[PDB]
């Protein structure tokens, strides 16, 4: 579950717990997740 | 398509539903949440 | 059983719902919006043009038609846009159901009986209809069956003399200054202050301003020497650009042009005027009923002090041996739409209706054979 | 299938791609270099003029043009070696084959228009061709309906308000400050510190010391102050020849010439002046959602720190009443590219393109006629 | 005996003169000029501002302000500068000697009156005062008792008409299509051809062109056709610089937003329809001699063939069986200064203007009092 820093972006709580147990069962590190689920990357061939 | 065409029709009392006359039968169909089923993008980073 | 529509399309508000409610299902402005800029982005799925709440809503972009005044539907394929939307999206109910009940201004034109009627018959098949004086409704309403009624809306004022559900058609006095010129006299002293209105869409922010500032003076010609003293009579409203205005002597100067219409050219006198005119038209046997039961109506008359001022200048005119009392109760925007309520539902009522066959048969002319 | 090409003319640089991608798949000045010299060896394949990428790497021996400037294509053959150059050699498909959008800047010359169309019709044989104001573009890229787009380009900067997808073509403000009059600025800056650049061959290196080491002032004389006592802002920067530069408070004062034209010369208002002054021109009930969304785009919007810039000196302009936003995407320096590959993929678009078959009928003067 | 001057304060210029005189003495732009660069050439005698014709002559050096706008003075020190240039340097008469007169656009904000006032009687000293609406003068000047008027200035546009000798304040529309307003749609549209206007100094310089190269359509789509279809209506002019231009459609284009508001994005109607609607506010005894007696005022109306198309568009509004004749005399961009001239000639009038005791006893607040 999000929580809307401002209307166009937004932050998982710290230590989330569902987060947490998914990064455990899959594998992945909190912080790849936590990063990538808020983020986004666009790229054009010579910058992103 | 509301005048323009012949199988497309609007129900009577609301703005958002529509009528099509489908093969078996007419059919009334709520525009409530389409948009939210129909989107779908998932992020190749989180792919990745 | 079919309930039936009642529908006060007034002038400025459209008012309506179902007989026997106790306040009305839909409240909207009456005015039709078209765009008046140039469409520039592509596919954004605009709409020709808007009624109510949208066009009120979106008012920047267009120009705002009020398809009536004075009580005369003046533009038909306006006008019509207004109805479709109050049965079919509003209330949400087809009028192809159950009858309707409407409304109107004393006085006004012929051929607006014959043009509704038809209207309501072929276009909207209706399968019967009524038509009644606003200010009869407002007697239901309040409880009473004889009175002085003052329905004072927008569009037009007009005083309707009843003795025990008997009119008096020779004493009825009809005048048409009414909210809609406290608004465009508002704008035409606001302009002194330095804010500006010229435009339809921010006609409807004077339309505001007066709703909440507003009050009515006791008398105006002390508070003309009191705003060269005070600025306690001064108060600041924000306006949706942000901007601050603080506004003085026109609080009682523009609001106040119902009680003395002299200001703008006209011969006529002001709502008092005719309402002591009004009972002077009236018989003798019945004066001191009148005095007695003058009701209050309709959204113009919800000043917080117009009774005191009603009171006092009757009270001037009259003989004060006489007495005068001013009916204003809280509901008073309303009671036009709420006596239509309870008197649609009476079950004695139930014979009046014009019906389509009687239409049919009669063509448009029927309604000044079967009502008033 | 037959996609659109979407080809930003800008003024400098062409960004180039396919309708649906999400940033274009060519990005190169548009720029045309002659050689100065007398070439001077016999038998060695040479070749006349070079287009974007090849007239950036050899700038040494070079001539540099550009045909377009302050949004005006102002040399009709180089213009078309350009284009030339973008569908044969660079996207590498043939124009025949495709429909194209191209971008403009508004309120521009009427036969810009007219010979950008003869040109794709006769020359490149297009099936079918469009022009689109730029700063509309930006808003379906940053994903509103209403707003006030802030686009500035290398060639031209412009304000265009948009509310609920009107363009409110009065307000549509335009100015001739852009990213190549801050680059020549800078040359006229760099000479303080003795460093000279007086040639076309080295004005590209001017514009790429611009790039990386400039930003933006919240409050420009405390800066100034700052900078004028403290050595620790400034930077160094590599020639190609391999000298180094340092530079100190100037690589902030080119950017402030947007806020302060003045330091130029010119009367008019710079950015956020005019931006304020485009929202005043709409009418009043819109004004709060203009002062909510503005959206910078283009890539002369890219120095770090402008984007709290106008948000703080929009608020010294703006109501205290007011909630004032700057919606600044770091992706804006191809807002206007984005902002058209998604157009030219809207379906309720396909109806609105000039096809050759009506050209053929109507000859030159379609495009105000049917065209945007 | 002691004559008036008379100065119109009007907008764009200033035009003034000696009480019963046939043409004002001084005619000049009420303008006023101040240098926007850093001074170069040493121990010039540099001036702080240039007023009047001085500024207009240095105009290239300067940035050029006017303290009007909508007829409302908005920057009060320099319009100080352009009375102070009237009386000392222009008219070159001591103003404490004899009365002087000042003119008004109707409806207009408070402290506009204060201001005109006590700056005649304290700063510049003037014995005795008046200051009028500018539509009765234009009528008082012109010959006749009975009128209506389209009063339209640089700045503003407004109705008010007169029956022998009376005025009727019921009756005002106004409107801020102008002469100025004209001028600055014809920047923006002389930009379709590929010239360009930025400065206070050249938007002075279209004023020119406005003035020689444009004309008003006797019916606007005809001569749009047969200017889109022949060439031969397109003629040509000398820039300051000795460039020539050409102008063909566009020259009737803008000086028929007087007939469409709708070009810069007003909502109301054109001078036609204000004209007709301003009668229609009118009691049925005063429209036909109102119908007959049309005066147009301010210089903003003297275009070649303006007159015929009002002459033409009312007669499309009123009733046919009505007369329409349009009174447009060769003075009527002075006719505001002619009618308070001759006006103020009268041995009668002298009774009327506000003496310096006046103000000394009551204050400047009797002008609220006893204009209009």
Redo the contacts between chains.
Sequence with gaps: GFASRDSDSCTIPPKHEPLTIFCDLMGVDYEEMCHWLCHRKLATATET | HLNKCALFEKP????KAFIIKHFADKVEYQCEGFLEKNKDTV????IK | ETTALVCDNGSGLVKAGFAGDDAPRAVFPSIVGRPRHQGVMVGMGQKDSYVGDEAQSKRGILTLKYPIEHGIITNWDDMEKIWHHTFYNELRVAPEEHPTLLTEAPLNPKANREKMTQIMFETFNVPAMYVAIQAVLSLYASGRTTGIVLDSGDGVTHNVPIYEGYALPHAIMRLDLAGRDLTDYLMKILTERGYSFVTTAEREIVRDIKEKLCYVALDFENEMATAASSSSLEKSYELPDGQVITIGNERFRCPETLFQPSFIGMESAGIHETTYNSIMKCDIDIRKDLYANNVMSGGTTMYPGIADRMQKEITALAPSTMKIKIIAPPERKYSVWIGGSILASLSTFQQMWITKQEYDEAGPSIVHRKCF
């Design positions: 009577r009392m609301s703005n992020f190749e980073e989180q």
